[PDB]
Structure 1
């Protein structure tokens, strides 16, 4: 996947706080993460895709091969098992930890990068446009 390549800035966000809460993020991390307006920088080198989110809150980075599970430390310090695939042009990122699971879909829509975060009954949607 490469249509995802480029530098992206968060422009809008709905229900993210509820999302973080449901995932289990403590209030302190919720406050500073909810107010963050991170840049998402996505690059690809062959089979390795790298995605960085930079913000004053925290900088994070993952690098992976489609279909290969990998260990991740999240901005909220969860140690999760992550598995990202490309499905109908949508990057589907799954995190599993403690028998729980959350799903993050990244898609390209017009000129937006759209992010859908799902946990249990909560769905948060985030939009990012080119910088």
Structure 2
């Protein structure tokens, strides 16, 4: 209980760096990269018991995942990858690993001051996405 209290809420993207390059490294195709890179998503995080729900809403796609920390699940990503995901809490950071086709990417979400900072890593390429409360 109260594991993720500081994450809960509705968040809006305010800045992005290197997202196109992250998407290229993941394998996202040109048209999706252009449209997704234009998106200004909200991220809506809630908790009910042990179940965490993360919704992403934008003009490109509306997605939702629900999960229990440490318990793998199957996810279809906004770029239509079918991945096996596990999300854990590591020293206060939500760490989301996605595995598919022998590849792996990690998305970290952390609270820093009044922001929720999202760091996406695919091999050597990192993208930093900053969200603020809506």
TM-score tier by shorter-chain length is over 0.9
Q: Runs (4+) of structure 1 moved beyond 2 Å? A: none
- Residue ranges of structure 1 left out of the alignment (5+ in a row): none
C-alpha RMSD of the superposition: 0.4
Partner of 2:86: 83
1:63 to 63, 66, 71: 66
Deviation at 1:57, TM superposition (A): 0.5
Q: Does 1:123 align with 2:126?
A: yes
- Residue ranges of structure 2 left out of the alignment (5+ in a row): none
Give the TM-score, by structure 1 length.
0.99
Deviation at 1:21, TM superposition (A): 0.5
* Distance in structure 2 (CA, Å) of the matches to 1:47 and 1:36: 30
Q: Secondary structure at the residue paired with 1:126?
A: strand
* Distance in structure 2 (CA, Å) of the matches to 1:3 and 1:40: 14
Deviation at 1:3, TM superposition (A): 1.0
Q: Secondary structure at the residue paired with 1:94?
A: strand
Deviation at 1:15, TM superposition (A): 0.1
Deviation at 1:73, TM superposition (A): 0.2
1:29-60 residue CA offsets vs partner (Å, 9 max, x unmatched): 00000000000000000100000000011101
